[PDB]
């Protein structure tokens with residue numbers, strides 16, 4: 001499956017881990033994605049109401065399954081059934097965010 005692990009304890013919640021399937025789907029390279037926020041997958045046609053949800057979840061720290069339109073590195077648009085999981089790996093506190101992308 002395609003997914004990335006982001007570390008919210010860092011500035012701008014950057015991708016610290018990206019599964020190979022992710023790199024395949026998005027056509028980017030690991031040297032390019034590591035350390036950057038995932039918003040780079042959004043484009044001109046990406047509904048902002050959809051991104052407002054994903055934004056609410058990350059802040060309110062909840063899970064969300066949102067269908068949003070993203071773009072590969074080449075410029076090809078594709079639908080992304082996006083699923084956000086909160087690695088509360090701690091004892092209360094949030095340690096990581098797990099994002100799973102499914103090209104629908």
Ligand SMILES: Cc1cc2nc3c(=O)[nH]c(=O)nc-3n(C[C@H](O)[C@H](O)[C@H](O)COP(=O)(O)O)c2cc1C
Nearest residue numbers: 004006037038039041042054055058097098099101
């Ligand atoms: C682990 C993780 C994975 C994400 N994956 C995606 C993605 O594949 N596509 C997307 O459009 N946004 C994705 N996001 C959401 C954006 O990074 C960002 O939270 C959203 O664009 C709203 O925040 P901003 O207003 O700072 O851009 C992901 C967020 C997290 C925490």
